[PDB]
Ligand binder design. Structure first.
Ligand code: NI
Ligand code: NI
Ligand code: NI
Ligand code: NI
Ligand code: NI
Ligand code: NI
Lengths: 215, 215
């Protein structure tokens, strides 16, 4: 009963990004018997501590844990310090625990898909980096990245291949394909097509099979 | 001869948004014999003058026109003052000229589609308005709009129906459907689906037929 009750984690602290991560984080380790108890606090705090910021995410979440996590720490508190330290590839903190892996996947899946396509441009909005045609002709020029549409084939399109969770990869594979199709429509529209999608960008930015013949 | 040469409009002034608008603005009035000469300057300056801003876009573009447009003004200069004044529904300047209509469509199509889906979130980025789940449960709550994802069914999803150009509407209809499908994937992902799309949002935010049976 301390499986649903402890939801009163940030549900009494002081954000929704976590609500979802847990949701898909559970689906990743469904019926594997790993530790769906630590992984939780892992994905529930990885942000409470803002390339130096993840190593402190645990040197921060550990001290703060000694407040409400007072009831049940045990050995399950050193694992909540690797997960919440190995999720953002800003610190390159390689995840070793099979629990610290499920999070580095659930949170990293928040970079792809519909929400992912929204983050790239929202962020790119404040930072004001643009994303216009200044990026299409990059078939012959070079990627300056954060031109948001470039951030696409620099991090995002390369995220699924470096996915370290069995299912999480095939999942970060579909969502990563949703981004390409967006690129497909963006190319056309960008080439005054207004209708179809550039069936040439789908051919280069996403592994066929995810939609296909066999020779 | 003075149809391609005059491209040296902003090509020597002091932005790419125009390059495209003309492209699709020509396709809208293809073989109709209207005035593919004024419509051009129309879509080439509607921005040089930043709900009061469109009426001045012409009270500004007219004076500036008296510089390079010195060679060929004629009656074709009073039309370049209605178009470049009737394109943004911020001034509600109803377009009367069939030329001032092709622009209010070509420029308004830049709100839908792939580029459209990027603008909503980019802009929403600087203004920092968010767009998270705080918008999904709005099936029972109310839309505060600029929550970017709301800006969707408030302006964008209503743009194609108020389109005033023969073809331009069926065109702003497809691109407007591309936005819904995005909403479709956003719903699923938002509901921890990670795979398909909420085939319930496609059912409510876009007129079937654009993809369908017949009873
Ligand atoms: Ni995160
Ligand atoms: Ni699959
Ligand atoms: Ni097959
Ligand atoms: Ni504009
Ligand atoms: Ni059609
Ligand atoms: Ni039919």
């Amino acid at each position: 009963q301390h499986w649903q009750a402890q939801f009163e984690n940030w549900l009494k602290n002081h954000v929704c990004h976590f609500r979802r991560v847990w949701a898909t984080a559970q689906k990743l380790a469904a019926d594997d018997d790993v530790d769906m108890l630590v992984i939780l606090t892992a994905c529930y705090f990885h942000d409470i501590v803002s390339q130096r910021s993840s190593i402190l995410a645990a040197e921060e979440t550990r001290r703060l844990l000694r407040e409400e996590f007072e009831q049940f720490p045990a050995e399950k508190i050193e694992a909540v310090c690797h997960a919440i330290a190995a999720h953002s590839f800003s610190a390159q903190i390689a995840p070793l625990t099979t629990e610290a892996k499920i999070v580095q996947d659930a949170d990293r899946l928040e970079a792809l898909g519909a929400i992912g396509l929204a983050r790239v441009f929202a962020v790119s909005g404040a930072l004001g980096v643009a994303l216009f045609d200044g990026e299409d002709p990059f078939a012959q020029h070079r990627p300056l990245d954060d031109y948001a549409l470039d951030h696409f084939q620099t991090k995002l399109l390369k995220l699924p291949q470096t996915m370290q969770t069995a299912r999480g990869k095939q999942l970060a594979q579909h969502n990563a394909h949703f981004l390409v199709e967006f690129m497909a429509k963006l190319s056309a529209e960008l080439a005054g097509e207004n209708e179809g999608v550039d069936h040439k960008v789908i051919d280069a930015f996403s592994s066929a099979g995810l939609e296909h013949h066999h020779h």
